[PDB]
Amino acid sequence: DPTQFEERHLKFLQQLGKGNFGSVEMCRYDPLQDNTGEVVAVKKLQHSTEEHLRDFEREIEILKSLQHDNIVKYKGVCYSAGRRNLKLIMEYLPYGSLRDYLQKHKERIDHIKLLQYTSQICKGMEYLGTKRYIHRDLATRNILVENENRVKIGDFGLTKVLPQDKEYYKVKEPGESPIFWYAPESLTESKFSVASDVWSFGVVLYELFTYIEKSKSPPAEFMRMIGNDKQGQSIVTHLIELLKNNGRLPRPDGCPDEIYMIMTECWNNNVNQRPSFRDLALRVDQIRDNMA
């Protein structure tokens, strides 16, 4: 009943943007028409194909199954438009994406604060992994800011559930892929695992310590490394060979070496040699303790 959202009571307020296969709007759920309703984030599919509706229902099921302080809260589903025009209702996180929050404030968010966010992302990812879910899109653009003290993992649009018998999930026909955050085995074999999210987490830590400086983003740096003359599929071929030959993102300007050590550990070509999220959360917490 309260998790039952009727479309007629959903008042559009502003467009929030684009997700992993649809659009997000800020809506006020106002069943008393007095503008006193809760402000929510609503995902609706732009192109309701059979494969896309199926993926959206899986995302909705995945989000519903997650209860953690550092995972964006699922609120409900709005069916009023029929089962072919589903709306996902999430909590509204008013500070927006960590990418945009950090780009806005830059060095005003100190290393203590960045490691508090890093710790939270680890705890979110570790809980995610207990459920055998592979996020597949860990990036500061998909991490949301609740307040200056708490971040949460968002966009579960690419999340996969591991087979019962396997420690990886093979994507047979990939869609739009954030290749600059991808592990080598994800680029070569399209294999995703907890270990490939750890690789992506190392990229997020890189992102945090660059403070989203335009020319320092992972695509900018990797493109500079493989050559800005590389286009389309060729980018993927060269990126694979670069990673195989230990080409990596640089240490961000002013990054503590302790933190860069973690990034490079996440970026290990050997899948089995990557740290766990349990151990990353313990290590980042010990770093924060040594700083306080």
Ligand X SMILES: CCc1cc(O)c(F)cc1-c1cc(N[C@@H](C)CO)c2nc(NCCCCCN(C)C)ncc2c1
Closer by beta carbon to ligand X, 114 or else 144: 144
Closer by beta carbon to ligand X, 185 or else 207: 207
* Site size for ligand X (CB under 6 A): 22
Least distance between ligand X and beta carbon 56 (Å): 9
Least distance between ligand X and beta carbon 117 (Å): 15
Task: Pick the closest to residue 139 from 95, 202, 89 (CA basis).
Answer: 202
Residues 5, 45, 56, 59: which binds ligand X (CB under 6 A)?
A: 59
- Is 200 a binder of ligand X (CB under 6 A)? no
In sequence order, which residues have a C-beta less than 8 Å from that of residue 229 and are 6 or more positions away?
Answer: none
Is 24 annotated among the ligand-binding residues? Answer: yes
Active site residue 137: yes
- Site map (CB under 6 A) of ligand X, residues 73-112, x = contact: ---------------x-x-xx--xx---------------
Least distance between ligand X and beta carbon 72 (Å): 4
Subset of residues 201 to 220 that bind ligand X, contact rule: CB under 6 A: none
Residues 124, 129, 154, 218: which binds ligand X (CB under 6 A)?
A: 154
Interatomic CA distance for residues 54 and 68, integer angstroms? 25
Closer by beta carbon to ligand X, 39 or else 240: 39
Single out the segment in contact with ligand X by CB under 6 A; choices: 137-145, 163-171, 225-233, 277-285: 137-145
Which one of 137, 155, 285, 289 is the catalytic residue? 137
Subset of residues 33 to 52 that bind ligand X, contact rule: CB under 6 A: 41, 43
* DSSP string of the chain, one letter each residue: -TTB--GGGEEEEEEEEE-SSEEEEEEEE-TTSSS-SEEEEEEEESS--HHHHHHHHHHHHHHHT---TTBPPEEEEE-TT-TTS-EEEEE--TT-BHHHHHHHHGGGS-HHHHHHHHHHHHHHHHHHHHTTEE-S--SGGGEEEEETTEEEE---TT-EE--TT-SSEE-SS--S--GGG--HHHHHS-EE-HHHHHHHHHHHHHHHHHTT-GGGSHHHHHHHHH-TT--THHHHHHHHHHHHTT--PPPPTT--HHHHHHHHHHT-SSGGGSPPHHHHHHHHHHHHHHH-
Is 20 annotated among the ligand-binding residues? Answer: yes
Give the residue numbers of the binding site for ATP: 16-24, 43
Site residues (vs ligand X, CB under 6 A)? 16-17, 19, 24, 41, 43, 59, 63, 72, 88, 90, 92-93, 96-97, 141-142, 144, 154-157
Which residue numbers are catalytic? 137
Give the residue numbers of the binding site: 16-24, 43
